[PDB]
Design a protein around this ligand. Structure first.
Ligand SMILES: *[C@@H]1O[C@H](CO)[C@@H](O[C@@H]2O[C@H](CO)[C@@H](O)[C@H](O)[C@H]2NC(C)=O)[C@H](O)[C@H]1NC(C)=O
Ligand SMILES: *[C@@H]1O[C@H](CO)[C@@H](O[C@@H]2O[C@H](CO)[C@@H](O)[C@H](O)[C@H]2NC(C)=O)[C@H](O)[C@H]1NC(C)=O
Ligand SMILES: *[C@@H]1O[C@H](CO)[C@@H](O[C@@H]2O[C@H](CO)[C@@H](O)[C@H](O)[C@H]2NC(C)=O)[C@H](O)[C@H]1NC(C)=O
Ligand SMILES: *[C@@H]1O[C@H](CO)[C@@H](O)[C@H](O)[C@H]1NC(C)=O
Ligand SMILES: *[C@@H]1O[C@H](CO)[C@@H](O)[C@H](O)[C@H]1NC(C)=O
Ligand SMILES: *[C@H]1O[C@H](CO)[C@@H](O)[C@H](O)[C@H]1NC(C)=O
Lengths: 308, 173, 172, 309, 174, 310
């Protein structure tokens, strides 16, 4: 009479790796690297903004494409490939820095800076920005002389931030089509724009011959004042921006889907997983498992498999 | 493994043991029978569960976009970002591979340990009534029926009850 | 524990054992008695101190300011720096967690191993003169006084002296 | 019957630690590995500190009133403060952060005259924005002017060779007047041109009348190399140049100095003093530091599993 | 180590055992003799080789220069680069130190384990025909010639063959 | 009577190694995990190396006299030297380090004419800094100027379409004259503006007279996309553009080349030939390298604990 001790085994075991052996066979194992992608931006529980044709920076100045997003509110901003910031040629200085602070802004609220003018025209427009005929950036004013070749008067405009959070201040410098064009819209002679707050001071001169409007920006502290001094070639802010709260920014071509939750996003969609690693995309945003090069890394959840 | 039970002195596993990780197979006058052991099976399963509790369902910190797919960022910073990302990927790839390999080594040894523990417990139970054959079996030197086999599994086996019978059976030539 | 002694076949620890990590408790005609074993206690502490020497008092690399708290650098570089900082934090938090968890697993098994080794040392010492209780005790089959109990503890016990007495006490 | 029993010690109340297998298992003893105790001070013992206070690090080069006491200084631990300011007259430094970064690790600065002498012009340009006792200017610089209102500034060349065996930090300014007529008032009428040339640097500057500012630029001049200045106005000339002393650590903090404690790891809120591998105090540190982790606590077992009765 | 054989109950190693990691040394009426154990030795070597295969010859990661050693780049970005490089150095130096220390710990215990396995295997083999002396030796209670010693080493020793002689040599009472 | 003992091997002197619990414990055998042996050479066996010598990597694009032999080249291993120079006339490349990183991994460059012909202007702009078969200029560039001293430089437009299936590296220069007087002499009086447009690039440039200077700028022109140059002077025109060949490594070193050894890991001090996971030779490396660690030595135990006879 005998009593024998032993352990279980299975016909089909799983090959795993250890410190001493490669492809050793165990009773069972679990995958640690996530490979299942969702080709969608999962927006359930979120308030998403699909910017579509509108470029993120365009929401601040307001070209035709962005008239829908002059004031937007979301915790998930989706930038699209065909998004455009501008209609008239030009760009933002430190453009990516501005994009990065906007992506987490929680959206923007717009407030009037309360600028009024006399002795000049404020109705500048171009066929490049059509919005039922020729128009301009919805948040900006193109300032010109009273008539062709008329002198543009030396001007000062100030704005104090009354709110309890920083104000995003945008302005533009118009670099005319030609030297002739500059003296036509504004006065003759050198043009200078100087912009001052209590922790920012910068001057700008136009660059005639290269038809473009370049936008510049600063963040104005609560109870601080921006001062604009200019005699032409100046694109004035009509409205300033205030950030609403907190958002996450994503770049994708994947469609939105409000029927699934997700907190990890990439260009190809959403990664939903409890696993510590993923092999889907090395560039992700939000809360993600770490990216690894390996397709599979199996964790033994059973003893060594020894069949008869 | 380190303990020499599983894939060691115990020849192979049992495909027929479906109610647990470890157990007892007995032979007597009434025939054979196999019964799983809850205590060591549960102790092994809980330890493996603990490992999964650590790796699964981690809270992850937030990361934002630092480059741009649609409009390329300044090329010097792009190169630094890319250089940094690859370095990050290599570290995490190393870590994941090492973690799994180390965890699996411990898991295998852990299960081997549990097998060895159960064997050593039964050896101490049987005292002078049994001799080990080297293959993980105990040669009981007395008539031990199905109900007697029960008590060995149950930890209720009184060795004094069978001591005299088994001792004189071990001495005979 | 991997060895099945501490929190295993040994029911519990002794709160009265203040002199060391491991020890012997004996009953005879003269009564109770507890004494700590120096060798196994010292072996375990030396191994714990070795872990500490590795982790505590490390020389560190110098790192400089790459940021400016008072004069904000352009958000582009700042966000890159911040991403990297957070990525570093992610790795070190992972490493630390794993290091401590792994070391603690080893420490627990190391101490369990020392208990087991001492138990095995005694077993081989006693030869045929004793049987194991299964709970960490050895039932000695000969009259063994305090001098005899001491010879076991410090490895001077001669089994030959008691073998005849023990063997007849075992066969009944 | 007689028996000998083996066993291990235990405590009434053990410490809960984490293993690979279990969360909150009790061991006899445990020791913390994550430093959480901060010292709200900059520990400067065995070190030579410089608390710059109201003086901005870049100010030590050009010398606004706030930086007069730090024109030449020597330290291995430079502490910047929130209230520190580089300038008195409006203007900025080209590549300011790069310059700040090399200054933090300079070991302080020594100053040397550049031997520039002038005649036929004025040297005493001053502003109400830099007051020492009335209108003054940057101590290390000279605001060059014409002899009188609307007089022609002469075409000038000024050369300086680095005689030392280390790079000289050469600073110069460009004056952008508040108007065109103001530029005509201080210097001659007509376009102004400033060229700065060494064997490794070549750049020209034109003033931008209307901006009302003095912008500062800089180069490092190798041993034996010459920097040549060519100008006809709007030029803020260096009177002295800087040389670095050795090695220092730069720190940004609001924490007060304390010479009665030793420390190698500094941050915004003070000093981390520890032999522990990790810290949960500040992710942003400078010096020789434990690595930052997000956990408040990670206990390293220093004893066996605790099993009592 | 963890198993108490090597640097434990076995006093020291045999410098004369040059043909294996583990062996048998016997003593009988014919004299002394040492022979290596192939099976236990190879089992330990295979596991150590496995560690070597996992670390030596491994595919390296691809490196490119972001710095310039001749025409030094702008200080700001150069300091970011240096910071990141030194942070990598810190992580990899830590990883390297830890990996080697952990592997060495496991290698020592692994070797200790194989000695322990071989010992326990012989113990079960000898059954009631021998006793452990505490030093890693078994004192055999029957005449065991050179061929008898051989059968133990090559795992063919039948304990039944000697049980009777052994028991009356062990149990020295009525 | 008879007895049998089990035991293990030992050696007279073993090797000290470190464990989790003990520093300098002795084992039977150990192996080094950190590489410290350096070859003071660039090992170029199995590779097609290009030693640039006196020519700077960016020089291969614009063509100063020192780069005549490298205007077109093919290699998988580009070696840069300390004495290498990109220019003859004073001036800088904008984004120079980004461009170097691109060129280092390009596999080399092939040149193709951009087919630009000019009317009503001169093309023979030259300087004694780039002397080569006459007081010439950058070999890949044209220094355009007015027909005579002070003549008005015509408002001009030049367009180039990339006719290949890979990106064209387009280079151009902005000339900053020694003085206002010089600029008027070469290009005529008045404002000067240069504009460069592609589908994903637009920049304007004005010359900054005062410092003798030719500053170079660049873009990557996509296949089928067109680059447009509009200018009225101070413009350094591309005559040829570059195309990349494939894959390569770029090294900065002063170590001599050696074709009798193979290496996949390179640094300023030479080559690291190793299969070890770690190295302590150099933290700046290029290619397939062991990870840099600060430790001089980490011995991996390959045997048991060594216990000699006492
Ligand atoms: C072997 O491991 C797998 C995981 O790799 C287990 O699969 C899980 O099983 C449960 C059902 O009990 C399902 O609800 C889960 O969805 C499964 N998870 C995955 C990731 O597949 C499986 O249970 C194990 N097999 C055995 C026989 O224990
Ligand atoms: C990078 O991280 C630093 C440190 O958190 C950021 O600076 C802080 O910003 C937060 C939130 O606005 C404030 O609470 C702190 O007072 C700031 N300073 C410090 C020293 O902590 C910084 O904003 C981040 N960079 C960017 C571009 O977002
Ligand atoms: C980044 O680090 C490198 C190398 O550590 C620095 O460059 C070296 O500086 C030393 C000491 O001043 C010189 O002797 C070497 O010749 C330099 N180069 C190399 C390749 O070692 C570099 O200065 C640091 N970057 C910044 C911006 O300070
Ligand atoms: C960085 O990597 C991305 C994605 O792999 C690539 O498109 C881009 O060209 C790289 N950036 C630079 C500056 O080389
Ligand atoms: C010991 O290891 C070294 C590598 O360090 C190697 O040369 C040798 O093959 C190994 N074996 C012996 C017996 O020395
Ligand atoms: C064990 O560690 C604790 C905490 O680190 C320490 O305070 C205590 O002195 C130690 N305990 C004993 C009993 O030495």
């Amino acid at each position: 009479d005998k009593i024998c001790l032993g352990h279980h085994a299975v016909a089909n075991g799983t090959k795993v790796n250890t410190l001493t052996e490669r492809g050793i066979e165990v009773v069972n194992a679990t995958e640690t690297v996530e490979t299942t992608n969702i080709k969608k931006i999962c927006t359930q529980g979120k308030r998403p903004t699909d910017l579509g044709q509108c470029g993120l920076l365009g929401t601040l100045i307001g070209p035709p494409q962005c008239d829908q997003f002059l004031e937007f509110s979301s915790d998930l901003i989706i930038e699209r490939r065909e998004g455009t910031d501008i209609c008239y040629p030009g760009r933002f200085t430190n453009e990516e820095s501005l994009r990065q602070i906007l992506r987490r802004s929680g959206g923007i609220g717009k407030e009037s800076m309360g600028f009024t003018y006399s002795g000049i025209r404020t109705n500048g427009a171009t066929s490049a920005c059509t919005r039922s005929g020729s128009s301009f950036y919805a948040e900006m004013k193109w300032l010109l002389s009273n008539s062709d070749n008329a002198a543009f008067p030396q001007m000062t405009k100030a704005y104090r931030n009354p709110r309890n959070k920083p104000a995003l201040i945008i302005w533009g410098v118009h670099h005319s089509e030609s030297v002739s064009e500059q003296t036509k819209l504004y006065g003759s002679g050198n043009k200078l724009i100087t912009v001052r707050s209590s922790k920012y001071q910068q001057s700008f001169t136009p660059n005639p011959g290269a038809r473009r409007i370049d936008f510049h920006w600063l963040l104005l502290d609560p109870n601080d004042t921006v001062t604009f001094t200019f005699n032409g070639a100046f694109i004035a802010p009509d409205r300033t921006s205030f950030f609403r709260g907190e958002s996450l920014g994503v770049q994708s071509d994947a469609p939105l889907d409000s029927s699934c939750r997700g907190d990890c996003f990439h260009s190809g969609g959403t990664i939903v997983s409890s696993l510590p690693f993923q092999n889907i995309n090395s560039r992700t945003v939000g809360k993600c498992p770490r990216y690894v090069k390996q397709k599979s890394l199996l964790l033994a959840t059973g003893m060594r498999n020894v069949p008869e | 493994g380190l303990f020499g039970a599983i894939a060691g002195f115990i020849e192979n596993g049992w495909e027929g043991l479906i109610n647990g990780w470890y157990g007892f197979r007995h032979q007597n006058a009434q025939g054979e029978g196999t019964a799983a052991d809850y205590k060591s099976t549960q102790s092994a399963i809980d330890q493996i569960t603990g490992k999964l509790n650590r790796l699964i369902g981690k809270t992850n910190q937030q990361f934002e976009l630092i480059d741009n797919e649609f409009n390329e960022i300044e090329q010097q910073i792009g190169n630094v970002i890319n250089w940094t990302r690859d370095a990050m990927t290599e570290i995490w790839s190393y870590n994941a591979e090492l973690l799994v390999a180390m965890e699996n080594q411990h898991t295998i040894d852990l299960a081997d340990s549990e097998m060895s523990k159960l064997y050593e417990r039964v050896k101490k139970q049987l005292r002078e009534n049994a001799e080990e054959d080297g293959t993980g079996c105990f040669e009981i030197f007395h008539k031990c029926d199905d109900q007697c086999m029960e008590s060995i599994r149950n930890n209720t086996y009184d060795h004094t009850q069978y001591r005299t019978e088994s001792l004189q059976n071990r001495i005979q030539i």
